[PDB]
Design a protein around this nucleic acid. Sequence first.
DNA 1: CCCGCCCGGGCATGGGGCCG
DNA 2: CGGCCCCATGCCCGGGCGGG
Lengths: 137, 137
Amino acid sequence: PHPRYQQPPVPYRQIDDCPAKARPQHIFYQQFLGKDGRRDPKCQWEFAVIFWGNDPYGLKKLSQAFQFGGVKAGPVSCLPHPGPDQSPITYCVYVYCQNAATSKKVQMARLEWEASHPLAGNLQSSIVSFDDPLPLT
Amino acid sequence: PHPRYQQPPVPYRQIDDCPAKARPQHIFYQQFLGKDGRRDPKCQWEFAVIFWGNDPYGLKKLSQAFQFGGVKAGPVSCLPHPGPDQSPITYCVYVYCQNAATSKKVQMARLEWEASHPLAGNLQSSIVSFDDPLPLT
DNA sequence: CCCGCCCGGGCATGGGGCCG
DNA sequence: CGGCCCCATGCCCGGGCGGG
């Protein structure tokens, strides 16, 4: 068909479903998150980490990399550009989490990835709280 | 620059610049937000309201309508869909705000519009908090 | 007046995959 | 290997329709 609007990243069953160039980051996060990456039925989706920066390509790899039961990235999006001026675009990715601890852990995971991979770009991040749970079931 | 990644909606100098379909909501929101729509240079961008639903077109109208000094919508994006199945995509729009009062007002403003216009679709929403301020200057 | 839902066109890729 | 490439791709515009 004809896409007019963004589509959600498709979830993985096999590691093959994850695009090859993003596989190491993905694997890293798995090992990093451990049990915290599995879906916990009792938790509801109230948290996120927003990652942002000027490079959409790296952000896409990050989005492709965080896909798990309890940690799910949305697609690459962007922030409003502040000036009435059209400025350098600031891209972002929301990584949704089922609790606060996991979101902090997610932040730190990406930091450690950057530490091990100098050529990866340095992303800004912030913890996000939602008053009401998101329909991520 | 980066045609395959999303672009931040463009600001309006005057009301004629607002795309036609979004213009009624835009007018209404302007009047409802009142002084709170103007930028307060002391405030930092720590809040948002996320609106979500299944109509990307409705959400596009909302995104275009909320563009002000202190209220700035991002583009139409979507949430991850939890199951590895075919389920309706849930689209969303983050509307960024310079303080908490204003975000409450934004939430309310859309509720009012929906109350005046029963043909309009009912958007779910939540207030959103950031630990660190966003680079909306 | 405004609603949801529909459609075609156009840009400049940029990332999966080949080859040096 | 890992740097490089090129056309399937991801994005956005804006008009239109029948209806309440």
